[PDB]
C-alpha cells in the first residue's frame, strides 16, 4: 500500500497490468527514440512492459528538466491534457502498452482492483513532487543531498558486516538532477562523506560506514 | 478534462461526488480545527462538501510548508500512507465526506465515471508539483514571480481596454508560499512592477498595464 518514493525512478510499479495488455495497444521504441515527442498531446496511460524511459519537462524557452525514470511495470499517467510539454525517450529497446480511457473502462470492468493500483501510482507521484517542492524551500543544497542518502540507507540499506550497502547505481549526474544541486557541490559533498568515512558513493553501490553520523550531519 | 493548474488552490473539483456522499462518512469541522492532525495516518479520500482547508506538510524538525488550499468539491487523495506528515486545517466551518477504499468500491460499482474524475484530480496534482520542481531548478525566485503573473494573465486575464485585469484575491503572503520566495523579495519585486507601470497587485484585483513587457 505504501505510496512513498525517495527517488523519481520506478514509481509504484503495477506488474498486474501485464494481464490486460491485449486491451491496449502495443507500441515499441528503439533506443534513443521519442515515446512522447515534444508538443505531442498524449491521452493514454502508457504502461512500460519492458525497457527504460527518461521523461522530461520542457519549458517555453526550450529549457529541459528530468521528471522521472521509468522501467518495467511503470505507468505513465498522462491520460488527459495537462498544459506541460513532456519529452519521453527510450533509453533502451522498450515495449509499451498504451491504454485509452475506453480501454481502461474495459480493464476496470474485468478487474476492479486495477483502479486502486493506479490510484497508488498517482498518489506516489503527488507525494514525491509535493514533498520535493517543500524540501527545496526548506533545506539547502548540501542538506538535501545528505537527507537523500540518509533516507535511501534508512529505506534500502542492507546490513553487510559493520556497514549498510545500498545496492544501486546512482551517478553524480542523477543526484544532481534529483536534488537540483549543481555538479561541483555534488562532487564536494560526496568527496567529504568519503574522506570523513561516512559513505562511499561508488559506481554500482553506496556503502554507508556510519549511518548515525550521516543522520546527524543531515540534521 | 483539462488537468492544468497555475495556483495550488481548488485543484480539479469533482462536483459530482456530491451524489455519493451517503456512501462515505460525513465529518464536520469548526474553524481552526484539524481535518488532518499532524502525525495522523489517513487512509481515506476526503471530499470537501463546503468550506475551506489549508493543507500543509510538516518535516521531522517541525518546519512546515503549504501544499495547497481546498474549497467546495475539492478532493484530498490520501487513500494510502505516503510517508509525509500532513496537517490540514478548516479555515472556516467545513463539511467533509471521508471515503474509505471500501466505500470507493461501492461508489465505482454504482458510477464508473467517478474513477476518471479522480484520475483527473490526481493528474492535475502531479502536473502541478512536477512542473514546480523543474521550474525551481530552472528559474531564479524573481523570474518565478514574473512567470506566475504572466501565466495568470494569459489564462484568466480579461482584456479590458488598454490594460489586462485578473479578478482574484492573491495576497503577497500567498504569492511567496506558491513561488517559494521570501517576503522581502516578493515586496521588492512587486513594488518594482507597479513603479515601472507593469503590474498592480491591489487587494482584490491585478492590473497588468503591459503584458508584452511581462
Ligand atoms: O523489447 C521487446 O519486448 C521487443 C522490442 C521492442 C522494441 C524494440 O526497438 C526492439 Cl528491438 C524489440
Ligand atoms: O504530463 C504531465 O504534465 C505530468 C506527468 C508526467 C508523467 C506522469 O506519469 C504523470 Cl502522472 C504526470
Ligand atoms: O499525503 C501526501 O503525502 C501528499 C498529498 C496530500 C494531499 C493530497 O490530496 C494528495 Cl493526492 C497527496
Same domain as A46, residue A22: yes
**Count helices and strands in chain B by DSSP H and E runs:** 5, 12
Q: Give the list of residues 6+ apart from residue B174 with CB closer than 8 angstroms, or none.
A: none
DSSP B28: E
Q: CB of B143 within 8 Å of any CB in chain A? A: no
Same domain as B7, residue B38: yes
Distance between CA atoms of residues A203 and A170, nearest Å = 7
Same domain as B147, residue B100: no
**Which position has the grid cell 482584456?**
B159
Tell me the H-state helices in B14-97: none
B179-207 burial by CB neighbour count: b if 16+ within 10 A, else e? bbbeeeebeebbeebeeeebbebeeeebb
Helix A141-156 vs helix A211-218: angle between axes, to the nearest 10 degrees? Answer: 140
Distance between CA atoms of residues A83 and B6, nearest Å = 10
Are the C-beta atoms of A77 and A43 separated by less than 8 Å?
no
Neighbours of B30 (CB within 10 A): 9
Same domain as A15, residue A112: yes
B93-119 burial by CB neighbour count: b if 16+ within 10 A, else e? ebbbbbbeeebbbebbeeeeebbbbbb
Q: CB of A109 within 8 Å of any CB in chain B? A: yes
Experimental method: X-ray
Q: Give the list of residues 6+ apart from residue A124 with CB closer than 8 angstroms, or none.
A: A3, A4, A5, A11, A12, B82
What's the domain count of chain B?
A: 2
Neighbours of B36 (CB within 10 A): 20
**The C-alpha cell of B198 is what?**
507593469
Same domain as A145, residue A131: no
Are the C-beta atoms of B165 and B157 separated by less than 8 Å?
yes
Report chain A residues whose CB lies below 8 A from the CB of B127.
82-84
Tell me the H-state helices in chain A: 101-110, 113-136, 141-156, 172-179, 183-195, 211-218
Residue A56: in which H helix or E strand, if any?
strand A52-58
Same domain as A113, residue A27: yes
Report chain B residues whose CB lies below 8 A from the CB of A122.
77, 119, 122-123, 125-126
Closest by Cα among A104, A137, A90 to A14? A104
Tell me the H-state helices in B46-198: 101-110, 113-136, 141-156, 172-179, 183-195
Domain end, chosen from A139, A156, A183, is at A139
Q: CB of B119 within 8 Å of any CB in chain A? A: yes
**Which position has the grid cell 503577497?**
B172
Residue B69, beta-bridge partner list: B9, B54
Distance between CA atoms of residues A3 and B86, nearest Å = 14
Distance of CA A113 to the CA centre of its chain: 24
Same domain as B118, residue B163: no
Given the DSSP bridges, would you call strands A163-166 and A158-160 parallel, antiparallel or unpaired?
antiparallel
Residue minimizing CA distance to atom 9 of ligand 2: A76
Neighbours of B23 (CB within 10 A): 18
Residue B214: in which H helix or E strand, if any?
none
Domain end, chosen from B139, B158, B186, is at B139
Distance between CA atoms of residues B138 and A132, nearest Å = 15
**Which position has the grid cell 553501490?**
A205
Q: Give the list of residues 6+ apart from residue B106 with CB closer than 8 angstroms, or none.
A: B23
DSSP B194: H
Q: What is the resolution of this structure in A?
A: 2.0
Same domain as A107, residue A88: yes
Same domain as B111, residue B196: no
Supply the CATH number for residue B102's domain: 2.60.120.10
Distance between CA atoms of residues B78 and B100, nearest Å = 10
Supply the CATH number for residue B155's domain: 1.10.10.10
Are the C-beta atoms of A52 and A87 separated by less than 8 Å?
no
Both ends of chain A: CA-CA distance in Å? 29
Pocket of ligand 2 contains residue A54 by CB under 6 Å: no
CA–centroid distance, A77 to ligand 1, in Å, is 22
CA–centroid distance, A115 to ligand 1, in Å, is 28
Same domain as A176, residue A86: no
Counting from 1 in the atom list of ligand 3, the atom nearest the Cα of B11 is 9
Neighbours of A9 (CB within 10 A): 16
Distance of CA B140 to the CA centre of its chain: 22
Same domain as B118, residue B177: no
Using alpha carbons, list the distances in angstroms from residue B189 to B7, B106, B124, B139, B145.
19, 51, 29, 15, 8
Domain end, chosen from A94, A119, A139, is at A139
**The C-alpha cell of B208 is what?**
497588468
Residues spanned by the domain of B82: 1-139
**The C-alpha cell of A213 is what?**
553520523
Same domain as B96, residue B202: no
Neighbours of B18 (CB within 10 A): 13
Amino acid at each position: 500500500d505504501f505510496c512513498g518514493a525517495i527517488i523519481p525512478d520506478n514509481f509504484f510499479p503495477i506488474e498486474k497490468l501485464r494481464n490486460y495488455t491485449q486491451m491496449g495497444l502495443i507500441r515499441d521504441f528503439a533506443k534513443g527514440s521519442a515515446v512522447i515527442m515534444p508538443g505531442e498531446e498524449i491521452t493514454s496511460m502508457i504502461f512500460l512492459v519492458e525497457g527504460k524511459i527518461k521523461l522530461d519537462i520542457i519549458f517555453e524557452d526550450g529549457s529541459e528538466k528530468l521528471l522521472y525514470y521509468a522501467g518495467g511495470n511503470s505507468l505513465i499517467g498522462k491520460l488527459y491534457p495537462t498544459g506541460n510539454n513532456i519529452y519521453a525517450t527510450a533509453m533502451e529497446p522498450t515495449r509499451t502498452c498504451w491504454f485509452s480511457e475506453k480501454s481502461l473502462r474495459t480493464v476496470f470492468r474485468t478487474d476492479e482492483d486495477m483502479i486502486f493500483e493506479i490510484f497508488k501510482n498517482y498518489l506516489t507521484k503527488v507525494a514525491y513532487y509535493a514533498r520535493q517542492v517543500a524540501e527545496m524551500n526548506t533545506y539547502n543544497p548540501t542538506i538535501r543531498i545528505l537527507r537523500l542518502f540518509y533516507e535511501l540507507c534508512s529505506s534500502q540499506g542492507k546490513r553487510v558486516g559493520d556497514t549498510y550497502e545500498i545496492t544501486m547505481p546512482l551517478s553524480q549526474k542523477s543526484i544532481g538532477e534529483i536534488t537540483g544541486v549543481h555538479h561541483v557541490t555534488v562532487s564536494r559533498v560526496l568527496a567529504c562523506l568519503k574522506r570523513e568515512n561516512i559513505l562511499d558513493k561508488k559506481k554500482n553501490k553506496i556503502i554507508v560506514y556510519n549511518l548515525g553520523e550521516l543522520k546527524h550531519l543531515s540534521e
